[PDB]
DNA sequence: GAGAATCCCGGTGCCGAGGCCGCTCAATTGGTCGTAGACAGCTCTAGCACCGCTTAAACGCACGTACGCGCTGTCCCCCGCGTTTTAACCGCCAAGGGGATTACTCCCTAG
DNA sequence: TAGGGAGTAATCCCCTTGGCGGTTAAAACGCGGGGGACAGCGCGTACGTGCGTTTAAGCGGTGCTAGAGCTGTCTACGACCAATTGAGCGGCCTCGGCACCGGGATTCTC
């Protein structure tokens, strides 16, 4: 049959996800995560769905900004693949230690 | 009772685009936006009026605040629109 | 004897007296001048008009009649001064711009 | 399985929304730790706003003020 | 005729160190640290009092404010110190 | 009888009450709130003075210099987190050398 | 010629403050490029502050007020 | 005929300037610079002496804060020497554009 | 093994950091009144829990090819250093221009 | 309807803008040599690609009750006002901590 170059259908998937605006994290594991992390500070705590939504959009926006900064720091480092030392450099030069 | 800027925002887009609908989420985005500029301008003006040992907030205080907060191009358009509106309001004679 | 509001006295479509009310019981200063709510009303009206103008041609560029926050997000971040004003704010359901760095393309 | 409740292609989805090309395998638990350490700072402020309000439920406004605290303010749910 | 805080911080210094002296630039630095954390805590108290629809500032909004603005060990130590002061004043009414 | 002495604190509760009242933050202002604010200001001043005092005693001098204040403000992680957005005049920077920039071997 | 007021051994003085063994010779013109902008951004928000006070001398109080507006509240000279 | 290796006296004077805390910029050319950047907006400007020292402390602190980050960027770039892309990478990761 | 280059130990004005008294406003005490936070009490939205069908997404094993990384060889440009030379800085005198402040007015903003 | 807050203005005195001059750290400039960054080439494996195989997200539907939210009433905390006493600002006065200078011990570098 006919195949594709590794690194070409990746660009199609990148442009598909960047034209898209849909949410990329599943709702129920995220709600379990925020309830298990809110159990540490105060028990018997209920939640509202728009609060979970605001938390979710905040975290994916911060993750997208961090991933763009890591990509920029990695292509500064004469490479293509991102590694954890670029994550540490981006967090160190972003202020959050 | 709850307050929104929905009708005023509505007529604002009706002068510029008559055949244009609006989303409720977009209306909430716009309401949060105008309220944020309002609280920023108000706290800048109150802080400046406290800094000049003055107990009165006037038009020149928010004039300096608009010069301070907004970037220069949108700043002089904003103060131009405000000056024509204020001079039109002050002609009550 | 009956006369209309201060907004059309200034020729504005945003509420002047409501801005004056929010300024007076917003607890910013103990004395508020007369011309300040008119100036603030004009500034916020102009900013809303400019934002809705940008959302307008952003939505005509998608061939639609309604405003989605995709159009608001685009009309914010393709303009540089609104980029400088709204750098630290995140919009609800906005996404990102289509961008790719030059060496990451299949240059050959 | 709560900390790793975020599945393996989900960090990939957030990565290609961030415009990366090649992803390593050791980033995933580190991004999970970064996620949990951001979430720890956010919801601590959120539940302090919650127990000040004499309530045991976290509704829509004490979270948007919580992200308004550190300069990561989000629009739309301010009412 | 400006007011300064020099006698109080000098008394605190001689309470903790009976030999160490201070300079005028150090004096201005710590006075500006005092006025800085004063305006930050009072601005947060005003904003939080506006959030809960109340016109009265008491110790409760400021203990919420020191819980959220300070790091942890300073927050609990300041809570313990201020609650001790509050019970000492209310006992000695 | 002074309210600071009735509270056991050494900071002017009346001054901070006047500064809170005539500063346009709220319509009404409590009575124990300036006392409590006086207490937390006294505690923070005492902790900063204690750290600066130890930093002065380690460096053989008996006078507080802003370099000692910067040394006492940066060696504590909590105070670095609180005051990371400030700059001390003539304070200096903590001495640090990277191991890659350190030459030779062993 | 007056734009050459900051001098190359003073840039070396700032470079040996940061703790770097080797400084390339084209850093010195880059360091001027990041300086004439940045202090400019306090001059945009100092003298207009001065202009609001009917004031034709800048002093020690309005400059630290401008830095507090920018986000670098500084100690030492009042305010 | 005693010649030092390049960089040893650099590290030694680095150590002395880590001990030192005085001002490193000449005062009078800095006054000339702030007057010549200030004359563009309203002529006949008077200047207080303390404001210029505050400005000098500000630019020195900002130099130190940016230079530490570009040092970390150049260390991360597997090099001993700084360059222009290190500077704009530090300005990009700090968020200063 | 030698040599710059430091850390360390002792003598010197000095000048800027500790008392001190004079005293002038600002914190303290008391009283009165009008409302705002506290508490009780009430009506219904909405959040938690659970069952079940559908299925699209996710896990896992398999392999194949770039790409990260190890080594290398070379221009070459920063680096340490001697020599001019140029403006920075300290001591100082003199002006005058602009900030602080006192003082009465009246209008316009609070109610 | 009231009253007090900008506002105008004049006066004093303080600092800061120019102008000296000498001298001196200190920048500018040219020069030899040595590691560093430069491109280039090979070794292998880690990431992407794929089909089989779960699985547990999603819809959606229902059942129940905590708890948000609103209303009523109350009284005690706090604004406001007048008299007062003391304490913290300031001007002035006096001296020892620290920088500065000089000269020998001591540690890296070559």
Swiss-Prot record, chains A, H:
Residues carrying N6,N6-dimethyllysine: 42
Positions carrying N6-propionyllysine: 19
Post-translational modification (record): Phosphorylated by IPL1 to form H3S10ph in a cell cycle-dependent manner during mitosis and meiosis. H3S10ph is also formed by SNF1, promotes subsequent H3K14ac formation by GCN5, and is required for transcriptional activation through TBP recruitment to the promoters. Dephosphorylation is performed by GLC7. Mono-, di- and trimethylated by the COMPASS complex to form H3K4me1/2/3. H3K4me activates gene expression by regulating transcription elongation and plays a role in telomere length maintenance. H3K4me enrichment correlates with transcription levels, and occurs in a 5' to 3' gradient with H3K4me3 enrichment at the 5'-end of genes, shifting to H3K4me2 and then H3K4me1. Methylated by SET2 to form H3K36me. H3K36me represses gene expression. Methylated by DOT1 to form H3K79me. H3K79me is required for association of SIR proteins with telomeric regions and for telomeric silencing.
Chain positions found as N6-methyllysine: 42
Localization per Swiss-Prot or TrEMBL: Nucleus; Chromosome
Keyword Cell division: no
Residues with PTM N6-malonyllysine: 19
GO molecular function terms listed in the Swiss-Prot or TrEMBL record: cupric reductase (NADH) activity; DNA binding; protein heterodimerization activity; structural constituent of chromatin
Source taxon at top rank: Eukaryota
Modification type N6-succinyllysine: residues: 42
Listed GO CC annotations: CENP-A containing nucleosome; nucleosome; nucleus; RNA polymerase I upstream activating factor complex
Biological process per Gene Ontology, one example term: sexual sporulation resulting in formation of a cellular spore
Residues found modified as N6-acetyllysine: 19, 27
Residue(s) carrying N6,N6,N6-trimethyllysine: 42
Protein name from the UniProt record: Histone H3
From Swiss-Prot, chains B, E:
Encoding gene per record: HTB1
Full protein segment contained here: 37 to 129 of 131
Positions of post-translational N6,N6-dimethyllysine modification: 2
Protein name: Histone H2B.1
Protein keywords: Acetylation, Chromosome, DNA-binding, Isopeptide bond, Methylation, Nucleosome core, Nucleus, Phosphoprotein, Ubl conjugation
Family note: Belongs to the histone H2B family.
Residues annotated with N6-succinyllysine modification: 11
Resulting phenotype, residue 12 to F: Confers UV-radiation sensitivity
Effect of residue 52 to S: Confers UV-radiation sensitivity
Post-translational modification: Monoubiquitinated by the RAD6/UBC2-BRE1 complex to form H2BK123ub1. H2BK123ub1 gives a specific tag for epigenetic transcriptional activation and is also prerequisite for H3K4me and H3K79me formation. H2BK123ub1 also modulates the formation of double-strand breaks during meiosis and is a prerequisite for DNA-damage checkpoint activation. Deubiquitination is performed by UBP8 in presence of SGF11.
UniProtKB/Swiss-Prot annotation, chain C:
Marked site: Not ubiquitinated: 107
A molecular function GO annotation: structural constituent of chromatin
Superkingdom of origin: Eukaryota
Compartments where found: Nucleus; Chromosome
Cellular component terms per the entry's GO annotation: nucleosome; nucleus
Triggers of expression: Transcribed during late G1 and S-phase, repressed in G2.
Entry comment on modification after translation: Phosphorylated to form H2AS128ph (gamma-H2A) in response to DNA double-strand breaks (DSBs) generated by exogenous genotoxic agents and by stalled replication forks. Phosphorylation is dependent on the DNA damage checkpoint kinases MEC1/ATR and TEL1/ATM, spreads on either side of a detected DSB site and may mark the surrounding chromatin for recruitment of proteins required for DNA damage signaling and repair.
Spans traversing the lipid bilayer: none
Entry keyword set: Acetylation, Chromosome, DNA damage, DNA repair, DNA-binding, Isopeptide bond, Methylation, Nucleosome core, Nucleus, Phosphoprotein, Ubl conjugation
Family of this protein: Belongs to the histone H2A family.
Function: Core component of nucleosome which plays a central role in DNA double strand break (DSB) repair. Nucleosomes wrap and compact DNA into chromatin, limiting DNA accessibility to the cellular machineries which require DNA as a template. Histones thereby play a central role in transcription regulation, DNA repair, DNA replication and chromosomal stability. DNA accessibility is regulated via a complex set of post-translational modifications of histones, also called histone code, and nucleosome remodeling.
Encoding gene (name): HTA1
UniProtKB/Swiss-Prot annotation, chains D, G:
A GO CC annotation given for this chain: nucleosome
Record's keyword annotation contains Ubl conjugation: yes
Record's signal peptide: none
Modified positions (N6-acetyllysine) in chain numbering: 8, 36, 56, 68
Transmembrane domains' residue ranges: none
Family: Belongs to the histone H4 family.
This protein's record includes keyword Phosphoprotein: yes
Name of this chain's protein: Histone H4
Modified residues (Phosphotyrosine): 28, 65
GO molecular function per UniProt: DNA binding; protein heterodimerization activity; structural constituent of chromatin
Source lineage: Eukaryota, Metazoa, Chordata, Craniata, Vertebrata
Chain positions with N6-propionyllysine modification: 8, 21, 54, 56, 68
Residues with N6-glutaryllysine modification: 8, 36, 54, 56, 68
Protein modification: Demethylation is performed by JMJD6.
Keywords: Acetylation, Chromosome, Citrullination, DNA-binding, Hydroxylation, Isopeptide bond, Methylation, Nucleosome core, Nucleus, Phosphoprotein, Ubl conjugation
Whole-protein residues included: 25 to 103 of 103
Positions carrying N6-(2-hydroxyisobutyryl)lysine: 8, 21, 36, 54, 56, 68
Cross-link (Glycyl lysine isopeptide (Lys-Gly) (interchain with G-Cter in ubiquitin)): 68
N6-lactoyllysine: residues carrying this PTM: 8, 54, 68
Subunit structure: The nucleosome is a histone octamer containing two molecules each of H2A, H2B, H3 and H4 assembled in one H3-H4 heterotetramer and two H2A-H2B heterodimers. The octamer wraps approximately 147 bp of DNA.
PTM annotation (N6-succinyllysine): residues: 8, 54, 68
Function: Core component of nucleosome. Nucleosomes wrap and compact DNA into chromatin, limiting DNA accessibility to the cellular machineries which require DNA as a template. Histones thereby play a central role in transcription regulation, DNA repair, DNA replication and chromosomal stability. DNA accessibility is regulated via a complex set of post-translational modifications of histones, also called histone code, and nucleosome remodeling.
Localization per Swiss-Prot or TrEMBL: Nucleus; Chromosome
């Amino acid at each position: 049959p006919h195949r594709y170059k590794p690194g070409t259908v990746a660009l199609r998937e990148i442009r598909r996800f960047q034209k898209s605006t849909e949410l990329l994290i599943r709702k129920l594991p995220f709600q379990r995560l925020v309830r298990e992390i809110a159990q540490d500070f105060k028990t018997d705590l209920r939640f509202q769905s728009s609060a979970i939504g605001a938390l979710q959009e905040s975290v994916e926006a911060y993750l997208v900004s961090l991933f763009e900064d890591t990509n920029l720091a990695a292509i500064h480092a004469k490479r293509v693949t991102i590694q954890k030392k670029d994550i540490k450099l981006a967090r160190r030069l972003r202020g959050e230690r | 009772r709850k307050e929104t800027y929905s009708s005023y925002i509505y007529k604002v887009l009706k002068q510029t685009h008559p055949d244009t609908g609006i989303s409720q989420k977009s209306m909430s985005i716009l309401n949060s936006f105008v309220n944020d500029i309002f609280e920023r301008i108000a706290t800048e003006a109150s802080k400046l009026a406290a800094y000049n040992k003055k107990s009165t907030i006037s038009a020149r205080e928010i004039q300096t605040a608009v010069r301070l907060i907004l970037p220069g191009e949108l700043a002089k358009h904003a103060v131009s629109e405000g000056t024509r509106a204020v001079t039109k309001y002050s002609s009550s004679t | 004897k009956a006369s209309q509001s201060r907004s059309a006295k200034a020729g504005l479509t945003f509420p002047v007296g409501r801005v004056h009310r929010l300024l007076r019981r917003g607890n910013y200063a103990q004395r508020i001048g007369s011309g300040a709510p008119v100036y603030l009303t004009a500034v916020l009206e102009y900013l809303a008009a400019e934002i809705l103008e940008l959302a307008g041609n952003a939505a005509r560029d998608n061939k639609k009649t309604r405003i989605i926050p995709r159009h608001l997000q685009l009309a914010i971040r393709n303009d540089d001064e609104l980029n400088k004003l709204l750098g630290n704010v995140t919009i609800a359901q906005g996404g990102v711009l289509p961008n790719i760095h030059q060496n990451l393309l299949p240059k050959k | 399985d709560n900390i790793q409740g975020i599945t393996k292609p989900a960090i990939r989805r957030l990565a290609r929304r961030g415009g990366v090309k090649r992803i390593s395998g050791l980033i995933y638990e580190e991004t999970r730790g970064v996620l949990k350490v951001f979430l720890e700072n956010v919801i601590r402020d959120a539940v302090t706003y919650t127990e000040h309000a004499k309530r045991k439920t976290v509704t829509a406004m004490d979270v948007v003020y919580a992200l308004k605290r550190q300069g990561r303010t989000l629009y739309g749910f301010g009412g």
